[PDB]
Amino acid sequence: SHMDSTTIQQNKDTLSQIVVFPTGNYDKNEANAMVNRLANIDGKYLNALKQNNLKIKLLSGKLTDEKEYAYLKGVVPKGWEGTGKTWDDVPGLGGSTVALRIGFSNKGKGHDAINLELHETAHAIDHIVLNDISKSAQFKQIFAKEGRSLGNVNYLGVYPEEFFAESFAYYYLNQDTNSKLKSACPQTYSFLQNLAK
């Protein structure tokens, strides 16, 4: 804990080669803050994303106003049936790509994650780096036991890919969320610790 500056330096170096900033207007300080939070992710994962030419696209407006996500206009996200909401209303996505609306990091800004950028980037790490580890037999057993223990039982507790992404965000956001994950989901915590060891 005496050389965190070096890990941040390396991870921000990596992120400067992954993050793409948008045309048009946004809060530059908040975009910088999002990158700073991403810099807590283990550098091995960040460098694996970089090798795969994954770009983390920060957006100045709605997700579906980007040409590459216009196919989601009017579409209801998985698990959002009955809400009257669509992807037009959702500030981030992760998987084969990552796209994130600047300013919408905190829980409740159109999404349910503890932190937008960490949750969405976790989806990309799951898919691109870890070969869909959230669907592995090992993770299935952990999810069967612990998958409701971050709440949102009808969403996180039903979709292992979402429980993986949310647990990853708790692990990496700050010391408080990291400790909360250890207490609530000890096997998931140990699983994530060992992946990065």
Indicate the annotated binding residues. Answer: 119, 123, 155, 162
Q: Is 131 left (phi over 0), alpha (psi -120 to 50) or beta?
A: left
Catalytic: which of 117, 120, 146, 161?
120
Query: How many chain residues interact with Zn ion (CB under 5 A)?
Result: 2
What is the rounded distance in angstroms from the CA atom of residue 124 to the CA atom of residue 76? 21
CB of 128 to Zn ion, least distance (A): 15
Active site residue 146: no
| Dihedral (Cα; 63, 64, 68, 71), 10-degree rounding | 140
User: Site residues for Zn ion, window 120-179 (CB under 5 A)?
Assistant: 162, 165
What is the rounded distance in angstroms from the CA atom of residue 197 to the CA atom of residue 183? 20
Spatial CB neighbours of 187, under 8 Å, sequence gap ≥ 6: 142, 145, 146
What is the rounded distance in angstroms from the CA atom of residue 111 to the CA atom of residue 99? 14
- Our CB check for Zn ion shows the closer of 146 and 162 to be 162
- Our CB check for Zn ion shows the closer of 117 and 162 to be 162
Site string for Zn ion, 63-82 (x = CB under 5 A): --------------------
CB of 188 to Zn ion, least distance (A): 16
The residues annotated as belonging to the active site are: 120
What residues make contact with Zn ion under the rule CB under 5 A? Answer: 162, 165
